[PDB]
């Protein structure tokens, strides 16, 4: 459905078609809403 | 016209915001943002928080502070 | 209101059933003469200008006579019920677009091929369950559809609550959600309406519909929102503007075919049909056969119409003095 | 150079 | 987002040394008046004899199919919705229309055709205004048609109307039709101006918010803002008229003041939908189904006139559309969002800009964009948008649906001069007037899109 092609390490917020990494935590935007991963 | 307000309010569910009016009363202060401001088709979003007056002696000091947090969206 | 004829069709309105020639004295008037041999039938009426005569029925050359009543020529308006699909959601998943198409489909034209689009959409959000969703799709459905500026009245909208179940919460573009105040709403009821009418220059038509809907997708999929079955109708169109058409069309057989045409240099025909009471119609139908050769027959009728307040007292005496009179076995509605 | 059009303006317009 | 106040404008009753400009200043921290004459001018116009209200021609389509009122068995009881097969074994029975529209002989098919096919027998019966057709199936078929196919609401359209070959007499007719007519309206403005060369007592000052905080030409102002009524009555005018001809309104001296809709009501009757989030789910499936009927497949050019920041809202929002395209990779190659300019700075130097200005739908549809420069006036539109601007900029506009051979809305005028012009010397009053009217002949070829938050 979705792709996201990029990684983007960053304090900050990515846009909404990047995958936010910071320091040990995975996160991806789903349903509006930024979602960690574990 | 007489005295300056400075505002902290919360629009619901949209964000938060920080606002500078110039009236006689407090509550013209909500009237001149609530007809003035951005949400004009939207007014009964607008939640003033907190209303005080500019007021001068010291005339260095913080009047407004309302951050949005990445846990708070 | 153009209508199709066998040949010849006349209309005599009976606002008052007589017993006798010199008792015809108000406009609307009528009593049915016949002989003692009942072999000719004929409608002695009142006009505004004197007292006129019917055809002449052969009562050995009538063909069918059948009285149709009020409530078979009410029209029965359309409802569409409109709920959230089952196999879907039954809770409106956040984030994705709820846009209802209604899809009409005689807008200005006599035909298909002039169809009408008016939309609703709405963006659910997180905390928004089924009633909350009705709330905002009809009043989204009421602001494009019923504003003050519009042309006809197409469709009204209508919730239901589930509590009550029997009883239309109308929503117009005035109508804002503060006023709508009930918790479980069910349904969302578009029906269509009344459009206007002069008599002779515009006929009652009405302009059907269907709610469509668009898709979302709820898991990843494509799938159409919502269900639009068609429920019962539960309000009827009175018989008066029809019938007050009928008689503009059958006084012109009888009197001038030139309606107000060059307008200061007419014949006004003077109509004794209210438009706004319904009436009891009996068509009787009947023809005549010459003398030698001339077989071929005339097929004529002769229309007459009476108003009934609930149980039908003036058409059903009216059948009782042509069957006391002619001798026929007309059915009593 | 004064097309039909002009004539009428220059007509039509009032000498009032 | 968020404004910072750069001016504020003061009625004057609330309040020489040299120059360094001969020419005034104005500032750009001041809102600037707008004409309408960019977008008033942008339609033609025509000349009419006389102010009499004026109508013309309307011609529809021809294509019909009758709806179904009831269906009943052969002993006159009615069908209902859960009844059994209607018509087994070709038993005969009445099918009840509004109309008398078949005739005898002739096949009519349901909503399903050709395969429940109907064969009438007989003349209309009439039953007040409603026609009994006692009709007998016509496709072999011994089992009948289901009661779910002889309900309220079925459209019934004629098919032929077949004979035997040998010894057989006539069936079938023929059908006709007719066409309607439309009026419009007229309205005439009135002006006046208790005056030389000075001002009068409608003054207001503007001044600006900087750190450290003439002679008026009358003869222009009356003209400009007479210009400006004629203006507002063509395009942003409404109708105070009855459904019984009747006006509801009454000026000074008894008579009724009679007003008809300008552009934007009468435009506004069809193909007007009030959206609060703007969606190319929404448009792209409202410009297709308008064009699916109405417009051929070359013929599908939709220009949208919107104002400034509706544009930026149809940027953003393509752009929206454009980056759910998992299929497609979109390049630098070929849409050039960062290109090679050149600059004193560095050798290969680059830049940075881009903006969707069309988007085009399947099946030919090309929605296309273009800036209007009146949808931004402060004056007018005060509802004010998150995102910026007035909230009527991001109301979008379809003019021009197709072609038409004759213009759709063109501007009424009197022949010659219909603008009046009057002094009266006491006092010395400036009277002015003028009558006008813009007529739209079909208002379904003028789509509109309005946020909800300008409604109701």
């Known amino acids: 459905m979705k792709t996201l092609r990029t990684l983007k390490i960053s304090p900050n917020a990515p846009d909404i078609n990047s995958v936010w990494l910071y320091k040990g935590t995975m996160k991806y935007f789903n349903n509006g809403e930024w979602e960690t991963i574990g | 016209a007489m005295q300056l307000w400075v505002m902290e309010y919360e629009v619901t569910g949209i964000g938060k915001g920080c606002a500078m009016c110039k009236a006689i009363n407090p509550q013209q202060a909500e009237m001149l943002l609530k007809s003035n401001g951005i949400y004009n088709g939207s007014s009964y979003l607008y939640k003033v928080t907190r209303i005080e007056q500019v007021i001068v002696p010291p005339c260095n000091g913080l009047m407004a502070e309302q951050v949005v947090t990445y846990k708070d969206v | ?333 | 150079v004064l097309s039909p059009k002009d004539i009428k303006y220059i007509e039509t317009m009032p000498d009032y | 987002a968020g404004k910072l106040g750069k001016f504020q404008m003061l009625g004057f009753q609330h309040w020489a040394p040299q120059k360094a400009t001969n020419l005034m200043v104005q500032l750009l921290a001041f809102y600037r008046g707008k004409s309408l004459d960019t977008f008033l001018n942008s339609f033609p116009t025509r000349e009419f004899e006389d102010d009499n209200e004026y109508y013309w021609d309307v011609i529809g389509s021809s294509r019909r199919n009758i709806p179904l009122v009831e269906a009943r068995d052969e002993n006159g009881v009615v069908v209902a919705a859960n009844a059994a097969n209607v018509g087994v074994g070709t038993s005969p029975f009445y099918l009840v229309f509004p109309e008398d529209w078949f005739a005898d002989g002739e096949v009519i098919v349901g909503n399903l055709n050709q395969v429940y096919p109907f064969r009438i027998l007989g003349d209309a019966r009439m039953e007040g205004t409603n026609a009994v057709y006692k009709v007998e199936l016509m496709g072999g078929n011994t089992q009948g048609v289901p009661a779910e196919r002889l309900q309220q609401g079925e459209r019934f359209s004629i098919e032929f109307a077949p004979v035997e070959k040998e010894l057989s007499r006539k069936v079938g007719d023929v059908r006709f039709t007719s066409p309607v007519s439309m009026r419009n309206e007229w309205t005439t403005i009135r002006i006046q101006h208790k005056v030389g060369n000075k001002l009068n007592k409608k003054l207001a000052m503007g001044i600006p918010m900087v750190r450290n905080l003439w002679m008026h030409y009358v003869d222009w102002e009356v003209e400009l803002q007479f210009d400006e009524y004629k203006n507002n009555a063509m395009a942003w005018g409404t109708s105070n008229r009855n459904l019984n001809g009747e006006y509801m309104n009454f000026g000074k001296s008894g008579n009724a003041i009679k007003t008809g809709a300008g552009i934007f009501e009468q435009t506004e009757v069809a193909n007007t939908m009030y959206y609060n989030t703007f969606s190319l789910k929404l448009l792209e499936d409202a410009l297709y189904e308008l064009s699916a009927s109405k417009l051929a497949m070359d013929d599908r050019l939709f220009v949208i006139k919107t104002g400034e920041r509706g544009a930026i809202q149809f940027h953003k929002e393509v752009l929206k559309t454009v980056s759910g395209w998992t299929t497609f990779v979109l390049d630098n190659n070929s849409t050039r969002v960062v290109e090679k300019v050149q600059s004193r700075l560095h050798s290969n130097a680059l830049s940075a800009g881009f903006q969707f200005v069309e988007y085009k739908a399947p099946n030919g549809v090309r929605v296309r964009l273009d800036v209007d420069p009146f949808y931004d006036d402060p004056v007018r539109n005060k509802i004010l948008h998150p995102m910026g601007g007035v909230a009527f900029s991001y109301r979008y506009d379809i003019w021009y649906i197709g072609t038409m051979d004759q213009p759709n809305i063109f501007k009424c005028k009197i022949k010659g001069d219909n603008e009046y012009r009057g002094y009266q010397w006491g006092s010395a009053v400036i009277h002015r007037m003028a009558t006008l009217g813009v007529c739209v002949l079909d208002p379904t070829r003028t789509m509109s899109l309005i946020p909800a938050i300008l409604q109701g």
């Open chain 3, 1 to 333: 209101m153009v209508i199709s004829i066998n040949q010849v069709r006349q209309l005599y309105v009976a606002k008052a059933l007589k017993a006798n020639t010199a008792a015809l004295t108000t406009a609307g008037d009528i009593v049915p003469k016949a002989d003692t041999a009942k072999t000719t039938l004929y409608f002695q009426s009142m006009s505004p200008a004197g007292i006129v005569a019917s055809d002449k029925i052969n009562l050995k050359h009538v063909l069918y006579a059948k009285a149709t009543p009020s409530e078979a020529l009410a029209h029965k308006l359309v409802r569409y019920s409109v709920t959230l699909d089952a196999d879907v959601s039954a809770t409106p998943v956040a984030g994705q677009n709820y846009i209802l198409r209604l899809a009409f489909r005689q807008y200005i034209g006599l035909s298909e091929e002039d169809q009408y689009f008016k939309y609703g959409e709405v963006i659910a959000r997180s905390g928004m369950t089924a009633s909350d969703f009705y709330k905002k799709m009809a009043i989204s459905l009421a602001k494009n559809l019923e504003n003050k500026t519009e042309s006809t009245p197409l469709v009204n909208i209508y919730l239901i609550s589930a509590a009550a179940a029997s009883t239309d919460v109308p929503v117009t573009s005035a109508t804002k959600e503060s006023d709508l105040t009930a918790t479980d709403y069910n349904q969302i009821i578009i029906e269509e309406t009344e459009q206007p009418w002069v008599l002779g220059m515009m006929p009652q038509a009405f302009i059907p519909f269907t709610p469509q809907f668009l898709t979302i997708t709820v898991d990843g999929e494509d799938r159409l929102w919502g269900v639009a079955t068609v429920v019962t109708p539960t309000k009827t169109v009175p018989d008066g503007h029809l019938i007050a058409d009928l008689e503009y069309f059958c006084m012109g057989a009888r009197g001038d075919i030139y309606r107000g045409m060059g307008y200061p240099n007419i014949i006004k025909t003077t109509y004794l049909v209210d438009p706004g009471a319904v009436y009891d119609v009996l068509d009787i139908h009947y023809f005549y056969t010459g003398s030698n050769e001339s077989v071929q027959k005339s097929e004529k009728t002769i229309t007459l119409v009476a108003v009934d307040d609930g149980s039908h007292t003036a058409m059903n005496a009216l059948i009782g003095a042509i069957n006391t009179a002619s001798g026929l076995t007309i059915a009593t509605l």
